[PDB]
Design a protein around this ligand. Structure first.
Ligand code: NPX
Length: 295
């Protein structure tokens, strides 16, 4: 891996937003870290009411105005915001030459499951209502937002809503019990995600519901009929086996899955693309994948 990976690992070993003592401090910690990646001058942000869900349009100069990624931010269903993820959103908008709708879906513990999935499906339905075409759309998300991407597709399919051309999952979180082998075997090399904080956030999202509830933990969902899926994951991740098991389940369901394991990469390494070469390389691959499925 690039020497820059050592700098990102060192940052994460000291700035541990998932290990902050309160939800308020976890939220503020991730906001402080995102504020470091300064936004390019050519990014246009437009706040919008996406059918009752607050959102922001992210546009860059080469955004095709009729192609849209609905972007579902990570943060364990508890943290993250339009602010934390607008840099990753603009990088994807640039690579995929599209507009990104970044939504502020309801967060736990204030709004437990299924609030997040109600909001992601409402935003997608609103895009259709306002004239977006499914063959020029995609849903993408990181970590909890990667799990929410799969759950959103399942819920839309079950409601008879036309599915988009493709979907992208970045280090998705789909096992809310943390029982993947890598949760043990990669614990020593993951500077961000460990079982204790994952179970803390799962508790807030589930509010006593079965941790294998399919739209909360899509490792247990019926995935038949989903569109082509790109799963990017790092091998230095306790969540590696979330991606491996999701790929197995989607392939068994007849889905066109690409599983891309990036050697030595850490959780949502794409968010560090300003400093990490593999982050920008992975975002270029996301853009290639989306443009191929919109052809
Ligand atoms: C430098 O900027 C960032 C921005 C968002 C980030 C999000 C995560 C995790 C919690 C995520 O939402 O998947 C990690 C690092 C991040 C760094």
């Amino acid at each position: 891996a690039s020497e820059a990976l050592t700098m990102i690992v060192n940052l994460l070993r000291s700035q541990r937003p998932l290990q902050e003592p309160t939800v308020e401090q976890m939220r503020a910690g991730l906001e402080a870290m995102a504020q470091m990646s300064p936004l390019p001058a050519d990014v246009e942000l437009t706040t919008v009411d996406a059918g009752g869900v607050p959102g922001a349009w992210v546009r860059v100069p080469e955004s095709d105005p009729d192609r849209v990624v609905l972007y579902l931010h990570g943060g364990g269903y508890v943290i993250g915001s339009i602010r934390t993820h607008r840099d990753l959103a603009q990088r994807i908008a640039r690579a995929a030459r599209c507009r990104v709708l970044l939504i502020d879906y309801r967060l736990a513990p204030e709004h437990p499951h299924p609030a997040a999935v109600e909001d992601s499906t409402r935003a997608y339905r609103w895009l259709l209502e306002t004239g977006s075409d499914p063959k020029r759309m995609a849903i993408a998300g990181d970590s909890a937002g990667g799990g929410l991407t799969v759950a959103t597709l399942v819920a839309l399919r079950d409601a008879g809503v036309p599915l988009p051309a493709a979907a992208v999952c970045l280090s998705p979180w789909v096992d809310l019990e943390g029982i993947g082998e890598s949760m043990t075997t990669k614990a020593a090399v993951d500077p961000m995600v460990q079982r204790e904080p994952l179970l803390r956030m799962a508790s807030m999202y589930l509010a006593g519901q079965d941790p294998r509830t399919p739209l909360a933990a899509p490792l247990y969902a019926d995935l038949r009929g989903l569109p082509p899926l790109l799963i990017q994951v790092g091998t230095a991740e306790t969540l590696l086996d979330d991606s491996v098991r999701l790929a197995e389940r989607a392939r068994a369901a007849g889905v066109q899955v690409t599983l891309e394991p990036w050697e030595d990469m850490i959780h949502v390494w794409q968010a560090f693309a300003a400093m990490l070469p593999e982050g920008q390389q992975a975002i270029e691959r996301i853009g290639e994948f989306l443009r191929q499925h919109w052809q």
